[PDB]
Amino acid sequence: HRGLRKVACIGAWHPAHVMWSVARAGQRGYHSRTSINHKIYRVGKGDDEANGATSFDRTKKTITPMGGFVHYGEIKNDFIMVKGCIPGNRKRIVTLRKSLYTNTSRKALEEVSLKWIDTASKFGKGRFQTPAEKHAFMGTLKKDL
Amino acid sequence: SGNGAQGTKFRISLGLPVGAIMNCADNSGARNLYIIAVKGSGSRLNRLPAASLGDMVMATVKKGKPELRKKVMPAIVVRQAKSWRRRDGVFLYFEDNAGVIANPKGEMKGSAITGPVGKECADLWPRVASNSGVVV
Amino acid sequence: PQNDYIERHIKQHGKRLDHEERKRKREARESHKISERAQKLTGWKGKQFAKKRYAEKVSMRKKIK
Amino acid sequence: MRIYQCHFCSSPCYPGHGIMFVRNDAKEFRFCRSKCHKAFKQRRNPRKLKWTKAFRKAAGKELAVDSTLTFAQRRNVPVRYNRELVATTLKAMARIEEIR
Amino acid sequence: SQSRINNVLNKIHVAQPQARDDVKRTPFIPESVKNLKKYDPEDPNRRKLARDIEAENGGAGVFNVNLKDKYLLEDDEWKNDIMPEILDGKNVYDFLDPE
Amino acid sequence: SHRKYEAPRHGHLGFLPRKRAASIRARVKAFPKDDRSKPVALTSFLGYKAGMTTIVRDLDRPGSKFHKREVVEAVTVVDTPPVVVVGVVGYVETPR
Amino acid sequence: MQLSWKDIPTVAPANDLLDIVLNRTQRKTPTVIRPGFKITRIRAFYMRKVKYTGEGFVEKFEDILKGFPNINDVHPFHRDLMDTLYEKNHYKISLAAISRAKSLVEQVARDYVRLLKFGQSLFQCKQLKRAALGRMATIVKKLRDPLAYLEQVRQHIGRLPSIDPNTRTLLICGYPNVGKSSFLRCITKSDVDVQPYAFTTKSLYVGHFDYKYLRFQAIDTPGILDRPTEEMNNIEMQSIYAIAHLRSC
Amino acid sequence: RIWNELYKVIDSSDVVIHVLDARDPLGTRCKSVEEYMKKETPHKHLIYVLNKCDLVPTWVAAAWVKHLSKERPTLAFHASITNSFGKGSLIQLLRQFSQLHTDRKQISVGFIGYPNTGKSSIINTLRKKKVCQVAPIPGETKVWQYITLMKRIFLIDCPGIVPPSSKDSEEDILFRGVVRVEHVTHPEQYIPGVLKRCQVKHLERTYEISGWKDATEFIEILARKQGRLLKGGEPDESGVSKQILNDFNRGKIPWFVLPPEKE
Amino acid sequence: MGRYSVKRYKTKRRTRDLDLIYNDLSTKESVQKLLNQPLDETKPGLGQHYCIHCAKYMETAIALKTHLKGKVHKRRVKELRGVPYTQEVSDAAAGYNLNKFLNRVQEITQSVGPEKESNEALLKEHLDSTL
Amino acid sequence: MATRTQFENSNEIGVFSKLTNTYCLVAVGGSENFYSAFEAELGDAIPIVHTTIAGTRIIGRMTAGNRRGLLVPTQTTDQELQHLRNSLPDSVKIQRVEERLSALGNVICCNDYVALVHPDIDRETEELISDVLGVEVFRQTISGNILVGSYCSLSNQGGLVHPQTSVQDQEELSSLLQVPLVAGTVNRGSSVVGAGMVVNDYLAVTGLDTTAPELSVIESIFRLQDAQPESISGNLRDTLIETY
RNA sequence: UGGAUUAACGAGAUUCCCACUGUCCCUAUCUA
């Protein structure tokens, strides 16, 4: 009766009030968070060709995935590669502050040495990292002859 | 956890809640199993305890050797049939859920396990890595 | 350890180098710690303490008589 | 770091893409994506689906038995990491791609 | 007991069979172990014994061991190099082979 | 009457009120404190969040299960062109 | 159990047992009831008090019963050992006293609760509560001597060693001051007295030693004087029962 | 809840009738209640009625009484609403017992025993109408009740009791009908028990059954003959086991056990 | 995604991956072994009367007698016709281990397939002789 | 030279180590205590290799090899294949296998002259083992127990089988092997014998709680300590029949 | 001791097994 996606007993007899901790409905999202201790994997130069290449991949490719990021253009300037997620959606301005103390966790002292940077398409289930690869795999098409 | 599980076990998906009926994998004679509690579970209001691959549960033979019933024995899952994520990224999964019977320290009841066995489970328990023939 | 092992130990090695000046001072200070526990120790630990000390003083008066 | 060919799509599947199913016969079927995973599940024929290399390479489309296509055997004798050998390999691999 | 003697006859009676052919079989002892002098826990002139390395570097859960640095190539200089492992596609190792 | 079965509270009360932020540029509220003998150095930097991709890195994490093994995991890409200085501002400490 | 029982909790003396169990029923039960509540609620309050106190005593006792090594019908060597040690008679009769007391307090609770379900006022039920609890209290206050005995038997038998009756043994015996313990200390890793006086030990001391990769236990005994088997000691009858039951060199 | 009504009828009864069943008196006595009765109220004398006698031939119908009458009345009597042999030994014994208390103005007497032994049936045969329900279901009557007959001998019955011992049985607990066979999830794991209890002749004569061994083969035989097959083709083992145990209880399979014989 | 495909081809409702089937059909001893199959009691027909091309236990002699003469079993008979799509098909259709592909298809086209077809013939004759 | 030790805190040395007369493979878990105990007596004579098979620590029961060469399972990656390759010298013909069953260490117990094999090994492998390992193969089963790898240790001196090996089957196996056999038992009564110890022509490493009786019997059959050549197995008959 | 123990049918009352499932673990998404 009268709703199921709610809370049944929002209060005891006494008090005759709803307490500030009963968790009612209202605006979700658009808050202002602060995650800490995100590791910086790669500081990508902006003039450089072959960013998305490592000491293993050694195939010349830039970090923009095929057809650019989604709802965002392509990468051209200097960038930061952070392990994990980060609050806020794409296109949004983020601030990066530095650590407020001296972290004593070996995850703060270790050296990262990447092996391969996925650059497939994010717009649909892509499978080739470069358009050169796509072409080599599919072979010629009706149009190019 | 459980005793005899060598090393720490990371988290993989939880495919077998309590009430599941998996298979018996070894040649101990048990034909299938029933899960009645999973050892090392958490504690959360309403959360059904659930078992993963490599976990040690408390099973009962629902049908099997006529001379094995009415008791509850420690079992160890070796297949899962719920896509868990290997670390070198690939979500793999198996064909059915199956486990083997072991005495609480971790030692096999039977003698040889038939069918592929999870690499994670075999790594965790060193007495499956000895009585198994097909490690995934 | 088979039998009276701590006693064999005490006779062979001894006690802490200061187990005597700690016991002595503990004793001399118990006289102070009795009144502290009587002016603190609210709420039924104070009742148990008072009844116990009454028992003790009664027994000592019995004994000296 | 061992790029695999989808068992159905024959595409490449890079580390972190697709699903793998392990049969009780211990054969690991890798899949490029869910399209091919679900078609496998429904038991269709990758040699009768028109869009897949199994059908093409042996249905009259792009050639198969080629002198370029004999350098990609799975090596099971791993010798020695010679640096000049790696150098010649790196040249020859791009040479092969262009010729084929 | 007269049911345990026969039971332990298994481990008692162990066969020295007849070699069942003309071929020979010998223990292969390497020359490399002969000159090898046994190890001492006390004497200061004991081997370096990489436990000493991980202890003095060091830490039983912190020593980042060099899993390279002991393997046998032509020149050591490129023992601390990298295998490419991939190219524009088609993982390198599958094309790698002599000639 | 008391509660029969116990369960932790639903939600976190440190993050309240759950209301829209005051701006899109969320503000920094605390800065790495100081040291007047280090060389001058910025403590913050603002950029733009652009997508998220995947990575495989070899792990040198001694005493871990994935020591000397590869590991795949996600990364975010933030798009940070050079930032350019246009002003300075000085703050004095008052008993307020 | 067997082989150096050290798993027996602790026998708090009767005043301490009273304290422990009564304070516990005071702390781990609600203690505010008002004359105004429903007579059902009052009856329930005091019922719970009585039943809980009963359970607490009963577990305190059931622990001792299930703990002690049960002198008779264990193994003749140990049976006669705790005979010569802790007086078989007193042992059995004390533990029996404890079992009787356990039954008594179960009965006290199970009568007074059947009563309380007929109380008609806070005062009637409060009087029943005090009555049942006071009866349990005297029942336990009787147990002064058994518990004072059991504390020392526990702190003794815990220390008491563990010689398997059947593994390869080696008994060492003779007169005081001869060299029993000299031989033991000189043959196997132990700590047994060597000082130049008669009864340099007073109980059975053990020491293992290996031979043909196998385990052999050696047992030094205090010894025997002349003592024409009429007058002896708990010192001597230990060696007696040892040389009797244990079958080795 | 049950032992309450039990002592209610023990106390409101002027005498007690401890109904046994003919097929297993030594297992459905398990007294530990007569010890209490004799000592707390000695003036009630614990008549015995060995009900369902016909399932025990006249031979054992004599053997099982001959060595128990040396304790109590022990009138073995199979009950039936038209042909109840054994009633003409007790309908007048209890009545003379009623006359004995001629300064009571009445008498009230009560039935005790295991469930599914026949107490409601005995009321109904001594009254001649179903004033209480008869039911093969073990726990049919769940509350005591007074019943008027002869306007002097009031009758009462109580639900069945089981002296709570954690010993000596689970299988014979299931073999006495005290728990319904729809409340056990393992019904085929006791068919070996029935096949070790009862012998093979009447097993063969009942259904009849295929020539067989091996209670598991016995159950598959039962089911393939009865058409109790599920979705291909493994048949309804739970269902056939439940039927075999309903047979066992209701007495559609002969069974008994033998005491020291005729001396 | 809707209900038919999922509540039919679920991981609890699998068939037996006809590469295994074709393997089991190639070799005569496997044919005879899976054809005799000492009596078990769970499988619906109880062992006998079982189609080796499909993987199903027909209940009775008459049931299999009709099953063989149908469009389902004929569909699978034609499904099992050529090279059964090993993983090497999918890995050589991308220019990899093409030599292993060629050796395998050569064996099937020259050495194994003849015996396979001969054995399905003999098995048909045996099914008749029994039926 | 019967040098008991312990992987991190496990007695199953055979599932975390692989030992032979020319090299050793040890897992890379945790710390250099296990490997240091190995290098204590193995020293610098034979190459040791910190390694990993298919990204696990259980290597002794996934690989299988003798001094002629090594044989690694399918799911080993090419990177660690290359690591092993560089680590060992040229003689050890490392080679992958394509197989139905990965745990080769449990289905082939082998030494430098002959290798018993689980019954359902394939023919390609049945001849591939001859190709590289340099032996002759016989499909067998150690007293019913399939998986001959973890239920019969072996060296060039003698073999140790799990205690339930019947006498006649033991005679058949000893005829197959032309070398002695003893129905052994390790680690306070662990039937799995090959998976609780690793042994070769100059050494055997077994668990810690492997008691002195069992240590002594295997020492007598493997002729490690100087010198116990298989007659001391009959010398110590004054103990092994009393202990049972 | 001259009035007594049952197929079929059932929106009759209760208990159970198989199939099956978002009832639940533990929720998620779409349409009007």
Ligand SMILES: Nc1nc2c(ncn2[C@@H]2O[C@H](COP(=O)(O)OP(=O)(O)OP(=O)(O)O)[C@@H](O)[C@H]2O)c(=O)[nH]1
């Ligand atoms: N010089 C010498 N003295 C010995 C020898 N054996 C025994 N003794 C003497 O015996 C003494 C040993 O005393 P214990 O071993 O304690 O004899 P005990 O007093 O009967 O020992 P307990 O029965 O355990 O109380 C030594 O101090 C020696 O004086 C021996 O071989 N050489």
Ligand SMILES: Nc1nc2c(ncn2[C@@H]2O[C@H](COP(=O)(O)OP(=O)(O)OP(=O)(O)O)[C@@H](O)[C@H]2O)c(=O)[nH]1
């Ligand atoms: N063959 C035979 N069956 C009887 C006899 N007496 C009773 N029965 C049957 O057994 C069942 C026993 O149920 P009840 O009549 O209620 O007797 P009960 O043992 O007291 O059972 P409850 O009253 O439910 O506790 C009855 O339904 C009858 O169907 C008898 O004397 N012979």
Ligand SMILES: [Mg+2]
């Ligand atoms: Mg002395």
Ligand SMILES: [Mg+2]
């Ligand atoms: Mg009844």
Ligand SMILES: [Zn+2]
């Ligand atoms: Zn497609």
Ligand SMILES: [Zn+2]
């Ligand atoms: Zn068919």
